[PDB]
Amino acid sequence: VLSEGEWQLVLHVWAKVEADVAGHGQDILIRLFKSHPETLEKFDRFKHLKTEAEMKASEDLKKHGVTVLTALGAILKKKGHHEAELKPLAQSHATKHKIPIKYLEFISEAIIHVLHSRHPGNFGADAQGAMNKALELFRKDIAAKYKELGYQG
Ligand code: HEM
Ligand SMILES: [Cl-]
């Protein structure tokens, strides 16, 4: 369970993300695909992209990044009260997309890397600690939902 103080560090850096969601979504998805190329294979819509340049030029990938970060933003703004938001996300990711928890760990790493790179004014050690705790909470609750849904994750 995060403290209010931890949530405020989380929401303070997220406020900067929100200056340019699309840009942050591109950086995060590209970082994920570069660091863990197996994750790209889960995306039938994107798995043809061969290079970072093709990824940067992909209008569709940018749209998807906005969709992803906006969903995560809405979860973070619930400050742990995210049962309603997690139900559809867990169901699609377990049953349609088949995304293991390991891959959620990978995108968590990508989010942290990008925030660390772009936002050193709002992402020092304590802020990164808080964001890690929020993402761990997200993954813990998603894992529990996966198990309820019948997906071992
Ligand atoms: C913070 C973690 C994540 C969030 C908030 C997130 C959010 C979303 C959202 C909102 C959608 C659109 C609606 C839906 O199908 O549920 C989506 C689609 C999808 N997600 Fe995620 N996602 C996350 C992590 C991942 C990861 C790590 C992968 C793969 C390694 C993944 C693979 C997909 C795929 C394949 C789709 C369908 C894309 C398409 O063809 O339209 N997700 N995700
Ligand atoms: Cl800090």
Side-chain angles (χ1 to χ4, degrees):
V1 175
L2 279 75
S3 74
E4 176 60 15
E6 289 165 338
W7 286 117
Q8 292 300 145
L9 293 174
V10 169
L11 297 175
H12 203 254
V13 74
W14 206 259
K16 308 305 167 196
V17 170
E18 283 184 336
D20 177 16
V21 206
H24 290 76
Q26 288 174 300
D27 288 1
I28 287 164
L29 290 181
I30 292 170
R31 176 65 189 180
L32 170 64
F33 299 150
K34 282 175 35 195
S35 297
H36 305 280
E38 61 269 41
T39 60
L40 178 60
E41 298 317 310
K42 290 289 181 169
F43 292 84
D44 289 348
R45 215 143 92 289
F46 301 128
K47 62 177 178 194
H48 67 287
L49 295 165
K50 291 189 188 292
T51 60
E52 170 169 6
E54 288 182 358
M55 288 172 190
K56 281 188 196 202
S58 171
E59 265 295 320
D60 246 305
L61 188 55
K62 181 171 151 174
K63 286 183 209 308
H64 185 62
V66 169
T67 295
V68 167
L69 292 193
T70 298
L72 178 59
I75 286 155
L76 295 173
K77 287 172 193 185
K78 294 308 288 291
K79 303 191 309 186
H81 293 93
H82 52 222
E83 299 88 357
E85 292 77 10
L86 292 200
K87 278 178 183 182
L89 186 64
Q91 181 180 48
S92 69
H93 285 60
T95 311
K96 178 176 185 34
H97 310 315
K98 295 216 229 276
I99 307 308
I101 293 304
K102 192 99 164 92
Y103 289 9
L104 297 185
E105 291 167 358
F106 295 157
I107 200 173
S108 300
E109 172 186 322
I111 289 162
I112 287 167
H113 171 101
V114 170
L115 298 190
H116 171 86
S117 183
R118 294 182 67 145
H119 297 296
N122 287 280
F123 211 70
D126 290 339
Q128 176 174 331
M131 179 61 74
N132 177 55
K133 203 169 160 179
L135 297 175
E136 291 188 339
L137 174 65
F138 164 73
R139 296 194 308 267
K140 176 187 178 156
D141 286 358
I142 286 286
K145 271 288 171 214
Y146 273 8
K147 264 49 96 201
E148 293 168 13
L149 289 167
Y151 177 57
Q152 288 309 302

